Design a binder for this molecule. Structure first.
Ligand SMILES: C/C(=C\[C@H]1O[C@H](CO)[C@@H](O)[C@H](O)[C@@H]1O)c1ccc(-c2ccccc2)cc1
Length: 158
C-alpha cells in the first residue's frame, strides 16, 4: 500500500509525509462553501490484492491558520459529513486494487462572522490530514500525513 499526489509526490510502503498544493476559489461569501476536494489530489493503491485487502481511514484532521479562524468546517469522507477539525476516526475505505484510486476526502469551509478580508493567505497551511492504513492480513498500521497548502489568497468580501 502506497500513495501519491496528483503531481506525483509519493509516500511509500510504511507511510510518511508529503505536501499538497491546491488552488482555491479566490472569493467566497457568507453562506457559501470553500470546497477543497482532495479526491483529485491524493491517490493510493494496494500492492498485493491477490492476498491482502487494505483499509483506509481519516484518523484525524486538523485546521490551521485562516481556515480555523475564518471558517466553520466539515470534512466529507466518501460523501458523508463529519466535524472538521475532526473529533473521531472515520469509517474505513476498502483498497483492493493495484490501480490507484482517490482518497475520498473533501473539506467544506463556510465563513463565520469574523471572516472579512483575506481569510486564507497564499502559501499558508490549511490542514493536516492523517490517512491511516491497516489490512486484513497482519498488523501493519501506517500513517500517511498530508500537509495541505493554499496556492492563492481567498478573500471574503465585506
Ligand atoms: C506488498 C506487501 C505489503 C505491503 O502491501 C500490502 C498491500 O497493499 C499492505 O497491506 C502492507 O501494509 C504493505 O504496504 C507484501 C505483504 C506480504 C507478502 C508475503 C508474500 C509471501 C509470503 C509472506 C508475505 C508480500 C508482500
Amino acid at each position: 500500500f502506497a500513495c501519491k499526489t496528483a503531481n506525483g509526490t509519493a509516500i511509500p510502503i510504511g507511510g510518511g509525509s508529503a505536501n499538497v498544493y491546491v488552488n482555491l476559489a479566490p472569493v467566497v461569501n457568507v453562506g457559501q462553501n470553500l470546497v477543497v476536494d482532495l479526491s483529485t489530489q491524493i491517490f493510493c493503491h494496494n500492492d498485493y490484492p491477490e492476498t491482502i485487502t487494505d483499509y483506509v481511514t481519516l484518523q484525524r484532521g486538523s485546521a490551521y491558520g485562516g481556515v480555523l479562524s475564518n471558517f466553520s468546517g466539515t470534512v466529507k469522507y466518501s460523501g458523508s459529513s463529519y466535524p472538521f477539525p475532526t473529533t473521531s476516526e472515520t469509517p474505513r475505505v476498502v483498497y483492493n486494487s493495484r490501480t490507484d484510486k482517490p482518497w475520498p476526502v473533501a473539506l467544506y469551509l463556510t465563513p463565520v462572522s469574523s471572516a472579512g478580508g483575506v481569510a486564507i493567505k497564499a502559501g499558508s497551511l490549511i490542514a493536516v490530514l492523517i490517512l491511516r492504513q491497516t489490512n486484513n492480513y497482519n498488523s501493519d498500521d501506517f500513517q500517511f500525513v498530508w500537509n495541505i497548502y493554499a496556492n492563492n489568497d481567498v478573500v471574503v468580501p465585506t
